[PDB]
Design a protein around this ligand. Structure first.
Ligand SMILES: Nc1ncnc2c1ncn2[C@H]1C[C@H](O)[C@@H](COP(=O)(O)O)O1
Ligand SMILES: [Cl-]
Ligand SMILES: [Cl-]
Ligand code: NA
Ligand code: NA
Lengths: 520, 123, 62, 61, 61, 30, 61, 61
């Protein structure tokens, strides 16, 4: 038969294939969908009143719908695969994908007298649809939990969909928009029924898997001397102290002086903090210290900020308070976890072209030099883009994000997601799922009221995401061995990226993308 | 219905004070091939706009900051405290996953546009 | 002319993505935090374009 | 003296919103007044009572 | 229990007015409120705040 | 199969489309 | 439209000096020509208020 | 002119610079900007213009 209950409505594909440039990832996981909001759209707001501050106010709605998110690299990549990709390519980018939902099973749970039994409702349905026109608030790219699990074996719960609208305090404005998912043409399923579609990534720039092997400043030959001169002295050396103009040709020895065609990238000052406890000043400056941007009278934290080097050499302990991504160690607590639990990423690789996060961009003269007045200079903590700058985008990690929807705005600049990734105008459409409400027996005499009693049930099934990535091979003529991600030989009680003695896959550290080195 | 007067043409050139510079350029309209008319004579032409972006007649219904789902919590942590709460006052590093309640803390992919400070004034 | 004569336009519609005209863009740290030195921050009154910004152009009127 | 004619062809971009609730829109208030908005007065003087923006319809971010 | 589907095709009749001034139109007031018009409340109860007529556009006699 | 128990016997259509004069409304309720 | 004679059919050099009451920021040098120009660069010229309404209230751009 | 300048060796301390990887490099020749406002011809940026040696000019000082 075509579609029956005693028939697999799809298969399990979890494979990675490398041919030439194209690497194909395929993942399958087993999901479970709870009933959300008792089949109800609820208005949710957080007020100014009460303990909560004004910066955490919001207005929105929580829907009875769940959504499928695969926006995390680890979903499509095995740790071993991530290794192959990082260690041999100068870049890569998504090309197309394929989604599938199958072997859907709906169960109805009954409880009597502390006795609980779960069996099948076959006639029951499950609704699915894609926001192919992008008419629904984009949830994804907010780094929200609920993406497919990293380990294929694990079975996961489907995230609940909800959105935010313009708000003043705990109130909404005239502008704020209320969306109803049901007002969307969605496809329905019964077990033996399957859903699926395909999408093709708009053209996007290859991510850089290469870390520079020349600093922006050191772009010139040591042996030669520039044909240009610079002002070397305003005053005669020694006792005389009489103003004079002396000019010198910037040479190899005087490298700093010599003129350059390109200058470092932009910077927003980030407060510095040291892993060692003692060094830090004894105040709770987590918030007061941190850089932030104020929008509509509300100050939001600048996380994770513009792309900047985490630390200057040998300052490894240092990190921006808010200027890097942080990943919890497995089993880590959501609130107030200790330092040991967290994995603080490090973006030092990009130090060569990008400004250090914790230091000034540089200095600019504050006044005209005078016969009486002395020259002055001021520091640059906040530096915007100017002609001649070059820079590197923030890195993605095996457990990082992949893409993000570029806001539909009149304009924007270098729209590469600040958390790292590919910026798409038309990203993979949001996939929405929901269990169709099955009413409990209605009262015998007609009632104008809307039914408030339903059979309790949840659904389960497999999901498949297959993505085709385009690689960009290395062309380096570097004579010496390059740096590469490896797993240390030395013995240990547990294996890296494996299950422990209890059956708990764990990702020991974040894994960057740039190991291979390319010239500037 | 209204009948209007035709604006007078005039232009500006590089100047120092009330003086002109060598660079400054003087244009003569008559040195331009122009068409002449007598009553019963008419002039006309057509032009096509170069491609330009559609003006936005739409006002956003989501703030840039509020771009994320309330229900879910970010898989990323932020530095929540530099010092232990209460009497002890000893430096420590505490990290929390930005949640729905702590919206301001959570990381974002996009940031607000540029600004030049403008002095405020009240009606 | 007196205030009554004038019609002052209002560009509040774009507040969601664009900075308020009269307020700072935000704040940036002015120094490295120290065992002795306290953390500091300075206001941003003038803010140029940087990667990741999005904004709305000014409106046209009848 | 003479007549002048300007004709411009504009390209529109229709709304695609799935917003369930009524959107904000420019309207002329019903409540009575001595003069009509954007009309001539008793003397024959057309007047533009207020500036009229362009953004009333709402779109997602 | 089951789903039901009703699909209706309506024929419109566009406006031809040469009225120079802005016409009256149904809009949702900008001014803030605790609940949105024609939305669910905090409990999940869609509500229709007022009746909505059909005649806003004006035509001559 | 054509008509079986493990088979959606229809889909959910809740859309409105405007072309020219004709506006099409589609509703689905449970 | 009506066209007056401009500058008595004369190209005149016009400058505003540093000297006198005027500040330095209002200095300029240029020329005033015997020519007139047609400008339609204002939205209200091509749009009736009612038309501006139709455009604003139903299009995203 | 020698006399106008303040009597200090501010060639380096005075000059604008950008710090990369913990090392400060001089901002030469900087962004493109006008060397001087009118009649300030003598003036130049310490590091903000290109400099070419006269033929036979010495490399140092
Ligand atoms: N990841 C990503 N997504 C979207 N847009 C991006 C991305 N990275 C850079 N850009 C921007 C930068 C330029 O404005 C343009 C490509 O030009 P080019 O000269 O090739 O940099 O796209
Ligand atoms: Cl975790
Ligand atoms: Cl020489
Ligand atoms: Na809720
Ligand atoms: Na004159």
């Amino acid at each position: 038969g075509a579609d029956g209950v005693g028939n697999s409505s799809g298969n399990w594909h979890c494979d990675s294939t490398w041919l030439g440039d194209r690497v194909i990832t395929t993942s399958t996981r087993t999901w479970a969908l709870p009933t959300y909001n008792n089949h109800l759209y609820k208005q949710i707001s957080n007020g100014t009143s009460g303990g909560s501050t004004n910066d955490n106010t919001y207005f929105g709605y929580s829907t009875p719908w769940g959504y499928f998110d695969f926006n995390r690299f680890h979903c499509h990549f095995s740790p071993r695969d991530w290794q192959r990709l990082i260690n041999n390519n100068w870049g890569f980018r998504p090309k197309r994908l394929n989604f599938k939902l199958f072997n859907i099973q709906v169960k109805e749970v009954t409880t009597n007298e502390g006795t609980k039994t779960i069996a099948n409702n076959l006639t029951s349905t499950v609704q699915v649809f894609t926001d192919s026109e992008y008419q629904l608030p984009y949830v994804l790219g907010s780094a929200h939990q609920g993406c497919l699990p990293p380990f294929p074996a694990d079975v996961f719960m489907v995230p609940q969909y909800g959105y935010l609208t313009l708000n003043n305090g705990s109130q909404a404005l005239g502008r704020s928009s209320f969306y109803c998912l049901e007002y969307f043409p969605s496809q329905m399923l019964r077990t033996g029924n399957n859903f699926q579609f395909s999408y093709t990534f708009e053209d996007v720039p290859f991510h850089s898997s290469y870390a520079h092997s020349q600093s922006l400043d050191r772009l010139m030959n040591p042996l030669i001397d520039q044909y240009l001169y610079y002002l070397v002295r305003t005053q005669t050396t020694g006792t005389g102290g009489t103003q004079t103009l002396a000019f010198s040709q910037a040479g190899p020895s005087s490298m700093a002086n010599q003129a350059r065609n390109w200058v470092p990238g932009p910077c927003y000052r980030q407060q510095r903090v040291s892993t060692t406890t003692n060094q830090n000043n004894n105040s709770n400056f987590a918030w007061t210290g941190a850089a932030k941007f104020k929008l509509n009278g509300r100050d939001s934290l600048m996380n994770p900020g513009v792309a900047m080097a985490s630390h200057k050499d040998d300052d490894d302990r240092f990190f921006p308070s808010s200027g890097v991504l942080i990943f919890g160690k497995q089993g880590a607590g959501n609130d107030g976890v200790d330092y040991s639990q967290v994995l603080i990423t490090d973006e030092e690789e990009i130090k060569a072209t990008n400004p250090v996060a914790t230091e000034e961009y540089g200095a600019v003269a504050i006044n005209n030099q005078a016969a009486n007045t002395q020259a002055q200079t001021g520091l640059v903590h906040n530096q915007g883009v100017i002609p001649g700058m070059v820079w590197q985008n923030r890195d993605v990690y095996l457990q990082g994000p992949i893409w993000a929807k570029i806001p539909h705005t009149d304009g924007n600049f270098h729209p590469s997601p600040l958390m790292g990734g590919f910026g798409l105008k038309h990203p993979p459409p949001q996939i929405l799922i929901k269990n169709t409400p099955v009413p409990a027996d209605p009262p015998l005499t007609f009632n104008q009221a809307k039914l408030n009693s339903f059979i309790t049930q949840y659904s389960t099934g497999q999901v498949s995401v297959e993505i085709e990535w385009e690689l960009q091979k290395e062309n380096s003529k570097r004579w010496n061995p390059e740096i590469q991600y490896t797993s240390n030989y030395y013995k240990s009680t547990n294996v890296d990226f494996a299950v422990n003695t209890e059956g708990v896959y764990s990702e020991p550290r974040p894994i960057g993308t740039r190991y291979l080195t390319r010239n500037l």
